[PDB]
Short mmCIF file of C-alpha atoms in Angstrom, two decimals:
data_model
loop_
_atom_site.label_atom_id
_atom_site.label_comp_id
_atom_site.label_asym_id
_atom_site.label_seq_id
_atom_site.Cartn_x
_atom_site.Cartn_y
_atom_site.Cartn_z
CA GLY A 1 -3.19 -23.69 3.03
CA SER A 2 -6.83 -23.86 3.36
CA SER A 3 -8.72 -21.43 1.26
CA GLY A 4 -6.13 -19.95 -0.83
CA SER A 5 -6.23 -16.04 -1.88
CA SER A 6 -6.75 -16.42 -5.67
CA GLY A 7 -8.64 -14.43 -8.13
CA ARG A 8 -8.29 -12.49 -11.43
CA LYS A 9 -9.99 -9.06 -11.85
CA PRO A 10 -9.31 -6.06 -14.05
CA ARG A 11 -9.90 -3.74 -11.11
CA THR A 12 -6.74 -3.55 -9.28
CA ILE A 13 -6.90 -4.51 -5.71
CA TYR A 14 -6.83 -0.75 -5.30
CA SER A 15 -8.20 2.07 -7.26
CA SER A 16 -6.09 4.61 -9.13
CA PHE A 17 -7.05 7.40 -6.92
CA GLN A 18 -6.08 5.57 -3.75
CA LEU A 19 -2.88 4.04 -5.30
CA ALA A 20 -1.59 7.46 -6.76
CA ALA A 21 -1.42 8.82 -3.30
CA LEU A 22 -0.40 5.55 -1.77
CA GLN A 23 2.70 4.88 -3.90
CA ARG A 24 3.17 8.71 -4.14
CA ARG A 25 3.41 8.46 -0.18
CA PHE A 26 5.34 5.13 -0.10
CA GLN A 27 8.32 6.59 -2.30
CA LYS A 28 8.88 9.15 0.47
CA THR A 29 8.83 6.54 3.27
CA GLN A 30 8.39 2.98 3.77
CA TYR A 31 7.00 3.54 7.30
CA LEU A 32 4.20 5.95 8.31
CA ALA A 33 3.80 7.55 11.65
CA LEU A 34 0.44 7.28 13.53
CA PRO A 35 -1.22 10.49 11.95
CA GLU A 36 0.75 9.70 8.73
CA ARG A 37 -0.79 6.20 8.15
CA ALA A 38 -4.26 7.21 9.17
CA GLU A 39 -4.07 10.24 6.80
CA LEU A 40 -4.19 7.80 3.76
CA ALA A 41 -6.97 5.99 5.37
CA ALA A 42 -8.85 9.09 6.18
CA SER A 43 -8.12 10.66 2.98
CA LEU A 44 -8.03 8.03 0.35
CA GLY A 45 -11.22 6.72 2.49
CA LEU A 46 -9.38 3.29 3.58
CA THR A 47 -8.78 1.90 6.92
CA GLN A 48 -5.46 1.55 8.80
CA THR A 49 -5.89 -2.20 8.27
CA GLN A 50 -5.87 -1.54 4.38
CA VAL A 51 -2.99 1.10 4.22
CA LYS A 52 -1.08 -1.06 6.61
CA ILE A 53 -1.07 -4.29 4.49
CA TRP A 54 -0.64 -2.34 1.41
CA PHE A 55 2.55 -0.87 2.67
CA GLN A 56 3.83 -4.09 4.11
CA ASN A 57 3.03 -6.19 0.87
CA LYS A 58 4.69 -3.52 -1.30
CA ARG A 59 7.89 -3.81 0.65
CA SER A 60 8.13 -7.35 -0.41
CA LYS A 61 7.17 -6.67 -4.08
CA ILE A 62 9.21 -3.46 -4.39
CA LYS A 63 9.72 -3.02 -8.18
CA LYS A 64 13.05 -1.92 -7.20
CA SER A 65 15.68 -5.00 -6.88
CA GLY A 66 18.16 -5.30 -3.97
CA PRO A 67 16.47 -5.47 -0.67
CA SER A 68 13.92 -7.91 -1.87
CA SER A 69 14.66 -11.51 -1.10
CA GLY A 70 15.12 -14.31 -3.74
#
């Protein structure tokens, strides 16, 4: 649109430690309650604004085929 979110780096947008728990939590449920979403931000050391976009984006890029659009 204006700036464009582009870039290439070996360090995934998220660390292995943060991801592990994240993905491990997502598989359980796509949505996270109040204290549930904060748990990842307080545990992984991230913020609700980060764990939120991570859970949302994923839903769109769900390795699993079916619900995703095309």
